[PDB]
């Protein structure tokens, strides 16, 4: 389930393997778009938060 717009749910993800390949290909994903980085090369940069 999902919460309300003013009650937007928030979570933090840490200490795992940033494998976006399994998700990006699956599902039609009608709208998907990134801002500061290319949505095609997520898999070669390391994050902290």
């Amino acid at each position: 389930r999902f919460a309300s717009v003013y009650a937007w749910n928030r979570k933090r993800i840490s200490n795992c393997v940033a494998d976006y390949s399994v998700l990006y290909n699956l599902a039609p994903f009608f709208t998907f778009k990134c801002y500061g980085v290319s949505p095609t090369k997520l898999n070669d940069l390391c994050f902290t938060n």
Partner: protein, 49 residues
Amino acid sequence: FSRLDKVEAEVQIDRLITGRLQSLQTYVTQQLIRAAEIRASANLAATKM
């Protein structure tokens, strides 16, 4: 080059290249002015000697 898709990052890199290029030309122009004034001083010193 490692974060932006290359079909779009050319705008940013061209802006940065133009900025650095302008800075380098500014340095060259200042060097020309100072070299001219030093040549004038050197001619004066040669006349003195």
